[PDB]
Amino acid sequence: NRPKTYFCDYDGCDKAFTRPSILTEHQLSVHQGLRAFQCDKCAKSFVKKSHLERHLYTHSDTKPFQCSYCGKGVTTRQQLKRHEVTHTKSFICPEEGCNLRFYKHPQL
């Protein structure tokens, strides 16, 4: 919506941003080499609250997305969708007019 009208000034940086706090998040993270959210359970650190929140689940068994078929736990919707698509007849015969459909790619 609103136009990108805050330009990073550093040598060899191309980026422009919508609102000045975001330009500052970029500058402190990329160019100065500082981060604002530390893991309690390992050495790593993160640039956003949502990124530390994802990393915190990785230290735990009670992972926040749970499979509808097998009940395996995962941390975000992309992982869930890819995993659940393995519980489907995903693959299709690529050859002309052939009707068949398959569950594991080596079968196809």
């Binding site: 330009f7 000034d9 550093y10 500052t24 309690d40």
Partner: protein, 305 residues
Amino acid sequence: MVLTIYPDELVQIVSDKIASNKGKITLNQLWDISGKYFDLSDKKVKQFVLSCVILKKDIEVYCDGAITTKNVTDIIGDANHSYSVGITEDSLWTLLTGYTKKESTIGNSAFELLLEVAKSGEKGINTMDLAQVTGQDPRSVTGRIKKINHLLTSSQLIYKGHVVKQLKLKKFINIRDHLATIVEVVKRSKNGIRQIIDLKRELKFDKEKRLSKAFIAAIAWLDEKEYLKKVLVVSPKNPAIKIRCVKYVKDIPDNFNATDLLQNQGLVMEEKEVLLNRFYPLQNQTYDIADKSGLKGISTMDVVN
């Protein structure tokens, strides 16, 4: 053993206790608070102590939600209705914020957030339990908390897998290191130029006027000591729209962000070193310059200057 205090010191302590517990306390809580410092084993002491509290104009007495104005001995003996004691709203405002409701900059919603931190005291409240207890979302809580971040001590903590900060009322940056960073940041800027307002914004010296003053002084010192040069850049289409920038020089051994304008050709760099006619009325003078400036017109900042 009863702790020794002067007769009027309890008025301070009861005010602090009342301001902590959201503006009102029960008579039993008042007696519990008093029992630490006076021997309430006898009604004679109770009558004396309750008078000290009722005598301060800032303090109010209530009964089943209504106001009460009987004699102090009547409040001790007339133990029939539900009774509570509190402080006038303007006084509660003043005791917590330092300003009266009539002039204070804190909004009602934000003041209620402050009252929750006041109730929690030494324990304080994490931003999510605060959010749940007040009954509003984290965006709203965060946008409101800005108005009171000067009154509250805070730090990061992890709670229910979410990342949150603790808040406590206070009662429960060295610029000399950063000069090297200011020179290196300008040194790393495109063509060795950076807007001073944008440089303040990068290092986050914009959060407090205290930090702003420190930054402006540092830039001036680096200019005087010849590590940097203050320079203007002028909009090729507008001589009044000029950008205050720092230029890199050597290594250490008007407020609009113009990073938009610096994207143009903008080559009008300038390294740093009144028409008023008495006889014709001011009307005709603004008219004459507005005419002489032609079809492109003139800005109010050009006319006044």
